[PDB]
Design a protein around this ligand. Structure first.
Ligand SMILES: NC(=O)c1ccc[n+]([C@@H]2O[C@H](COP(=O)([O-])OP(=O)(O)OC[C@H]3O[C@@H](n4cnc5c(N)ncnc54)[C@H](O)[C@@H]3O)[C@@H](O)[C@H]2O)c1
Ligand SMILES: NC(=O)c1ccc[n+]([C@@H]2O[C@H](COP(=O)([O-])OP(=O)(O)OC[C@H]3O[C@@H](n4cnc5c(N)ncnc54)[C@H](O)[C@@H]3O)[C@@H](O)[C@H]2O)c1
Ligand SMILES: O=c1ccn([C@@H]2O[C@H](COP(=O)(O)OP(=O)(O)O)[C@@H](O)[C@H]2O)c(=O)[nH]1
Ligand SMILES: O=c1ccn([C@@H]2O[C@H](COP(=O)(O)OP(=O)(O)O)[C@@H](O)[C@H]2O)c(=O)[nH]1
Lengths: 336, 336
């Protein structure tokens, strides 16, 4: 049971609010959309369809009622444009900021456009929210910001040298949010996501994440490549745990704001054992090569989620094996 | 005898290089231009006259020869446009990046404009220089990067939380420069300036610095305002020490790069005593109210400049007294 999360969702159903989700047509954003509409929230969505898709919006339309879909206003637009940010902020109570161009290799190859979307666009959105006096502000940050700190598990207070432009941009979101608390009284929550996965995570394109990438390949019968020796390890985190942490953050008591939380489950899986689990799960639904290390890439990752457990009553419920089992049916339909 | 600095300066007289100076129409920038043309260098300038002034350029042309001036190619333009950055980088050897919007209180009122010039702009210039493979890249950092850290004097390796939107931008400049060393092998030198003063430091405008602001006010018989009890203290640094550090850094050996250096004198002067020293030096060239602390002010500021002295052979030869004597005539003229 996710008991605090249950309570807060009950509050929201009784007294519905207006939410802004940026990055709404993406993986996490469209999952957030799905959950908030199922709670009868009024949602304003902003996306530029850079890495996101019209079809993710279509899918969510089919998963919620007509009345629930009638409360969603989608705005095609770009967080880089301050005017657009100010416009979509109007009457908003809660901000969930997911719009960014992710990927560590992407930041290395084009630190410029990435800087514009992940720093300028984050600040545009943070400033507009402040000026609009929204009730809350929760933004996607990154475990990549631990960088080369060798300690396991990772605790929020202790970060190393950033190994990529992506690590920098997400770090800078954190520092702007802390300064906004200091200088305007404007209190936010940054969510350091660790390797999120699940439905509507894009399997296609040069930057696809390992889980949908591999699922896609295992299904096609293609080669499954491993960047390095496969001992590189991660805390894979099923999207529902992320959806919990956003909603808990949006309604956090004030003393729990102006903080950073790890968002994960606390487990460590190497690339090797994941190759296993994925094959296993897909094969129950009836259907290997080493290359060099990926540069900028973090070696090992396991979160410590005590802080979120403590301060927000976060209850991570779905672990890597069940999450894969929950996701593979989606990948089949989508890729059939 | 600044033997190292004199040595380097004698070499440049004999073997001219091409320098790019951003923020060339500004205080520190036009001081750098004056010095480099006097050494017969080739200088490309870039400035959008946002806080800088055509009249500073006109002034530098009065101080150098036709043939020296002939070697200054001036571009009116904006570091926020990447094409403009790459265009001024062509054939450059040494980059002196000074273009930015200074001022803590400016950044509190308008964090977006400050971000755009100080982060996007900086990154455009760093990226263009990396792509053009210049020999050296030296940028204007800030003592605001010390943030809330309680050490005093300030030493480069130990910094705290940044305390305003401006301070975030200047810290992010050093972070990007370190990640660029790490990821592309492009080694830069960041110069944490402390309270620079001297000729062509603008005395006019809401954001004028204390020494020119007070100087203007004393000449006019305007009220000299002291924010606080006047015991507040700074490590005021005459421009020629800053010019010195820029040229030592441009010609630094490789092991001296990817490093930050404080640029100041190492001395601490109070606001009360400064008012006294500005009065005295203006009086030999023949011709006060107490209000509340500026908010987000820093109480005491003083650099440890050991690392510069050691690694770069810096000589902080002009102290505040001498510097104010040298500057006072420039203000008298500029004002009558
Ligand atoms: N998936 C993960 O493992 C993970 C890990 C760390 C951080 N994050 C962060 O979580 C957030 C969501 O990531 P995701 O994994 O859903 O990826 P995603 O690419 O599926 O979604 C990002 C969405 O942002 C939109 N977008 C991008 N730039 C935009 C702009 N300038 N203006 C308007 N919209 C823009 C895209 O079209 C896309 O729909 C991002 O901030 C990302 O950096 C995700
Ligand atoms: N003077 C000090 O005490 C001090 C202290 C800390 C840091 N600095 C830094 O030193 C550098 C030089 O500062 P300064 O004191 O001479 O200030 P300044 O305002 O006199 O000069 C900055 C110059 O940059 C130009 N500029 C600003 N934005 C630009 C843009 N987008 N494109 C092109 N040109 C632009 C201005 O027009 C101006 O000529 C800055 O990076 C500043 O932040 C100065
Ligand atoms: O086809 C692939 C794609 C990714 N990876 C590796 O999987 C890990 C997780 O990468 P992902 O892009 O999913 O997330 P990251 O940890 O960068 O956010 C990284 O070490 C990648 O180099 C891999 O071995 N093969
Ligand atoms: O009219 C003025 C302007 C500034 N200051 C003070 O001078 C110090 C340094 O101010 P400045 O703006 O020169 O540079 P900063 O330290 O912000 O970079 C601070 O104590 C200010 O409160 C002052 O007492 N009176």
């Amino acid at each position: 049971y996710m008991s605090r999360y249950e309570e807060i969702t009950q509050q929201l159903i009784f007294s519905p609010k207006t939410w802004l989700i940026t990055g709404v047509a993406g993986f996490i954003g469209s999952n957030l959309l799905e959950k908030l509409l199922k709670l009868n929230q009024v949602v304003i969505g902003l996306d530029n369809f850079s890495t996101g898709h019209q079809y993710n919006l279509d899918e969510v339309k089919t998963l919620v009622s007509t009345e629930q879909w009638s409360r969603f206003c989608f705005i095609e637009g770009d967080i880089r444009d301050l005017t657009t940010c100010e416009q979509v902020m109007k009457g908003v109570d809660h901000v969930l900021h997911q719009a960014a161009l992710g990927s560590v290799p992407r930041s290395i190859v084009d630190p410029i456009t990435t800087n514009a979307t992940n720093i300028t666009g984050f600040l545009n959105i943070l400033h507009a929210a402040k000026n609009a006096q929204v009730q809350s502000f929760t933004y996607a940050a990154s475990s990549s910001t631990y960088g080369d700190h060798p300690a396991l598990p990772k605790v929020e207070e202790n970060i190393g040298n950033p190994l990529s432009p992506y690590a920098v941009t997400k770090y800078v979101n954190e520092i702007y949010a802390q300064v906004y608390a200091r200088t305007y009284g404007f209190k936010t929550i940054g969510l350091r996501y660790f390797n999120v996965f699940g439905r509507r995570q894009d399997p296609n394109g040069a930057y696809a994440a390992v889980i949908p990438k591999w699922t896609a390949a295992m299904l096609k019968g293609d080669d499954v490549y491993i960047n390095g020796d496969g001992e590189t390890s991660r805390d894979f985190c099923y999207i529902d745990n992320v959806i919990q942490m956003n909603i808990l953050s949006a309604l956090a008591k004030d003393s729990a704001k102006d903080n950073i939380y790890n968002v994960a489950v606390g487990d460590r899986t190497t690339l090797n054992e994941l190759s296993g689990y994925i094959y296993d799960e897909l094969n129950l639904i009836h259907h290997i090569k080493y290359r060099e290390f990926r540069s900028g890439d973090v070696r090992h990752s396991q979160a410590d989620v005590t802080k979120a457990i403590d301060l927000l009553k976060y209850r991570p419920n779905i672990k890597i094996r069940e999450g894969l089992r929950l996701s593979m049916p989606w990948y089949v339909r989508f890729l059939k």
